[PDB]
C-alpha cells in the first residue's frame, strides 16, 4: 500500500507493514504460511502468520476468527504472545487476508524430542505445558491439537502453546471434522467419533510426553482407521463398558477387531529410556511413568485431568498458584459463532475483529 510491501515467500506473496523487515519462511501449514522476521520497531525478531484462506469457506472463517479472538482474549506466561494483527487491503470489500504477529520462540518441541534430557528439564517443560493448558481449560476452551509442531521453547527453558485455529469449546458431539486434528495424536474419543470433553487435550500431552521418552512417535498409524489398531496394540482393547459408549455403528467395527491384551507401561516405557533417575524421590522414572499411564488412557472418563496432572509427583515439584491457578482469560462471548454465519456475515466479524486490534 505504501507502508506495507510484499516479499517472495514460497509459491506465494507476503505483504507486511515495512517495520517487519527480513522475512525468512519457517512454517508451511494448513493453518497458514509462517515466517520469522526482525521488527525494526520492537527490535526483536518476531513471527508473522498469513491466514491460509481465511474465507475459503464456512469453516476457515469460524476458525480464522476463532484464533484472532483467542490470541487476543488470552494472556499467560505460557500461551504465545500476541503482538499485532494487520491487514493490507483498505475496504471490507477488498478485505482479502489477514496476517497475525506473535512473539518468536527459539525452537520446536520436535527439536526437543531429538535430544536426551534430565528429569529436571523434562519435568519442568511438561509443567509449563500443563500450565498453559490449565489456562485455556479454566475458561472452558479446548485446544484439540497439541502436537510438538505446536509447542515452542527457548534456551532459558520455557514453553508456550500455539495455533488456536481448532481451539474451541466442548465437543457437543463428535469432532465431525477430526480430519484436521493430526492423526498420530488424535485421541480415542476423536478417533471413534464420540464426543470430546476437556481432557482430550490431556491425551495429546500423553502422546507428546511419550514421544519425548521414546524419541519416536507412539501411535504410528498409516491411515485414519489404522490409527486405532496402534492404540489398542499398545494399550490393549477397551473394556465392555467403554464399548457401550460408542455409537451403534462404531461399536461393531471396534468389537470386530482382534482382541489385544496390550503391554504394561513398565514395558512400553522401560527405565533405560527415562532420564538418569537420581537418588531423589519426586523426580523418578517410576513417577514419570505413573503420570504417563494416567494420560495414555482410552477412556476419558477414567483419564487424568490438568489440575490432577499439575498435582502429580513428577510435575508438582515446581507448582506455584501464580501459574497453575492464574485467572482464566475472559471472552466477551464472541464464540457465539457456533452459529455458522455466512461467509459474508463472517467476513464482517473477521475484517473488523481484525481491524481495531
Amino acid at each position: 500500500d505504501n507502508n506495507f510491501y510484499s516479499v517472495e515467500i514460497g509459491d506465494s506473496t507476503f505483504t507486511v507493514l515495512k517495520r517487519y523487515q527480513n522475512l525468512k519462511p519457517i512454517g508451511s501449514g494448513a493453518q497458514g504460511i509462517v515466517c520469522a522476521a526482525y521488527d525494526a520497531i520492537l527490535e526483536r525478531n518476531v513471527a508473522i502468520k498469513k491466514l491460509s484462506r481465511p474465507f475459503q469457506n464456512q469453516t476457515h472463517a469460524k476458525r480464522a476468527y476463532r484464533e484472532l479472538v483467542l490470541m487476543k482474549c488470552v494472556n499467560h506466561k505460557n500461551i504465545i504472545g500476541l503482538l499485532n494483527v494487520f491487514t493490507p487491503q483498505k475496504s471490507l470489500e477488498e478485505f482479502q487476508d489477514v496476517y497475525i504477529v506473535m512473539e518468536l520462540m527459539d525452537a520446536n518441541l520436535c527439536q526437543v524430542i531429538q535430544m536426551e534430557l534430565d528429569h529436571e528439564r523434562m519435568s519442568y517443560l511438561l509443567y509449563q505445558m500443563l500450565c498453559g493448558i490449565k489456562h485455556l481449560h479454566s475458561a472452558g476452551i479446548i485446544h484439540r491439537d497439541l502436537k510438538p509442531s505446536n509447542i515452542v521453547v527457548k534456551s532459558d527453558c520455557t514453553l508456550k502453546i500455539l495455533d488456536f485455529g481448532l481451539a474451541r469449546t466442548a465437543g457437543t458431539s463428535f469432532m465431525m471434522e477430526p480430519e484436521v486434528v493430526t492423526r498420530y495424536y488424535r485421541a480415542p474419543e476423536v478417533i471413534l467419533g464420540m464426543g470430546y470433553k476437556e481432557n482430550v487435550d490431556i491425551w495429546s500431552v500423553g502422546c507428546i510426553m511419550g514421544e519425548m521418552v521414546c524419541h519416536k512417535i507412539l501411535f504410528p498409524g498409516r491411515d485414519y482407521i489404522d490409527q486405532w489398531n496402534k492404540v489398542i496394540e499398545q494399550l490393549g482393547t477397551p473394556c465392555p463398558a467403554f464399548m457401550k459408549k460408542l455409537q451403534p455403528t462404531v461399536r461393531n467395527y471396534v468389537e470386530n477387531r482382534p482382541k489385544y491384551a496390550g503391554y504394561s507401561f513398565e514395558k512400553l516405557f522401560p527405565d533405560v529410556l527415562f532420564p538418569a533417575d537420581s537418588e531423589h524421590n519426586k523426580l523418578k522414572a517410576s513417577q514419570a511413568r505413573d503420570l504417563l499411564s494416567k494420560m495414555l488412557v482410552i477412556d476419558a472418563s477414567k483419564r487424568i485431568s490438568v489440575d490432577e496432572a499439575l498435582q502429580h509427583p513428577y510435575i508438582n515439584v515446581w507448582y506455584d498458584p501464580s501459574e497453575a491457578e492464574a485467572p482464566p482469560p475472559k471472552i466477551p462471548d464472541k464464540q457465539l459463532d457456533e452459529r455458522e454465519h455466512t461467509i459474508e456475515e463472517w467476513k464482517e466479524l473477521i475484517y473488523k475483529e481484525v481491524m481495531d486490534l
Binding site: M115, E120, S155, W318
Partner: peptide, 10 residues
C-alpha cells in the same frame, strides 16, 4: 529443587 535456566537446543 530449582527450575532450569539453559536448554541446549543447538
Amino acid at each position: 529443587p530449582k527450575r532450569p535456566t539453559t536448554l541446549n537446543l543447538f
